[PDB]
Design a protein around this ligand. Structure first.
Ligand SMILES: NC(=O)C1=CN([C@@H]2O[C@H](COP(=O)(O)OP(=O)(O)OC[C@H]3O[C@@H](n4cnc5c(N)ncnc54)[C@H](OP(=O)(O)O)[C@@H]3O)[C@@H](O)[C@H]2O)C=CC1
Length: 322
């Protein structure tokens, strides 16, 4: 249809509340990203989420360009998000990174550009640069300077809105309390699901009118060594399955709806045609206050993606309570 559910960002732009995630483990051919995004748009997704580090923007861009060129959708009805990887946190390297992504995508602008992760690494083509002894080559960069460069990208029209990802309370306050701040981040994309519902960070973001965008909302890709294979399987949870049976939906759908009813914009990744179409069903039903509370009770406070290889530097975001 021509209309769909969106929320107003603090900069006046609108973000579709259901986004399609495009990250897929290395073993998965990039060609799959192309097919998956086209199906997502066909199914009704109007929000597509990617990043330079996913190494799929050429494919994701083609999918978008294809669905626009054949009349399926208009550019203004696609909300595309990219992210600035950590090897380009230095002010002077921010715009070149966005322009590189745009060249790969063959798009004129991105609807949203995020600082992907708060820990910086040395400049260069390598996303995770290491010295001869395997040590990650960390870099010292003032994120407030990185943000000013992000703001300039917005003023240049290259990015409609700018936000962050994997930022904690301290880091957000740092950007928000920054002298001469021109644009607040429109969002903070972080891991969020029933086992880690981010209640505290969520309320903080709400008090500043920052949209919290949940990733790994279905339990994550569970790809090693990024995620502990011993971690509980979210969609297998008994309460979610009970609710699924009750509503005649699926555990995945219950988990996605949960986020939508607590004011959270949710992402959902899937390269399976049937599950892709299934996910848009999140707009076909609603959960009661009691069901919502039952899901709140599932919080385990255990994080799936710690990205500890980036632990050590002061900016590592997951040490603080939130
Ligand atoms: N900014 C950041 O730091 C990060 C952002 N992300 C973003 O979040 C997105 C989603 O995260 P992850 O990638 O963590 O994905 P999700 O947690 O959304 O999905 C996990 C798994 O759910 C399966 N699934 C999808 N739909 C259903 C369904 N209806 N029923 C049962 N299983 C289902 C998928 O399998 P299948 O494909 O076989 O259907 C997929 O492997 C990414 O693609 C990326 O865009 C991810 C990590 C970090």
């Amino acid at each position: 249809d021509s209309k769909y559910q969106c929320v107003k960002l603090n900069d006046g732009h609108f973000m579709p509340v259901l986004g399609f995630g495009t990250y897929a483990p290395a073993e998965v051919p990039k060609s799959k990203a192309l097919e998956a995004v086209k199906l997502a748009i066909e199914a009704g997704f109007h929000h597509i989420d990617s990043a330079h580090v996913y190494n799929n923007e050429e494919q994701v861009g083609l999918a978008i360009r294809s669905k626009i060129a054949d009349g399926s959708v208009k550019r203004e009805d696609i909300f595309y998000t990219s992210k600035l990887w950590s090897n380009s946190h230095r002010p002077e390297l921010v715009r070149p990174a966005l322009e590189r992504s745009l060249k790969n995508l063959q798009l004129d602008y991105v609807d949203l550009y995020l600082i992907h992760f708060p820990v910086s690494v040395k400049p260069g083509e390598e996303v995770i640069p290491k010295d001869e002894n395997g040590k990650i080559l960390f870099d010292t960069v003032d994120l407030c300077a990185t943000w000013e460069a992000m703001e300039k990208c917005k003023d240049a029209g290259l990015a409609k809105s700018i936000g962050v990802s994997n930022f904690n309370h301290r880091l957000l306050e740092m950007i928000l309390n920054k002298p001469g701040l021109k644009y607040k981040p429109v969002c903070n994309q972080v891991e969020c699901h029933p086992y880690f519902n981010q209640r505290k960070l969520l309320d903080f973001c709400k008090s500043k009118d920052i949209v919290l965008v949940a990733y790994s909302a279905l339990g994550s890709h569970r790809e090693e060594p990024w995620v502990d294979p011993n971690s509980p399987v979210l969609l297998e949870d008994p309460v979610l399955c009970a609710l699924a049976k009750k509503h005649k939906r699926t555990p995945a759908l219950i988990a996605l709806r949960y986020q939508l009813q607590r004011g959270v914009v949710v992402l959902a990744k899937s390269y399976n045609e049937q599950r892709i179409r299934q996910n848009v069903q999140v707009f076909e039903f609603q959960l009661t206050s009691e069901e919502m509370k039952a899901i709140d009770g599932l919080n385990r406070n255990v994080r799936y993606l710690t990205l500890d290889i980036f632990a050590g530097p002061p900016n590592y975001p997951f040490s603080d309570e939130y």
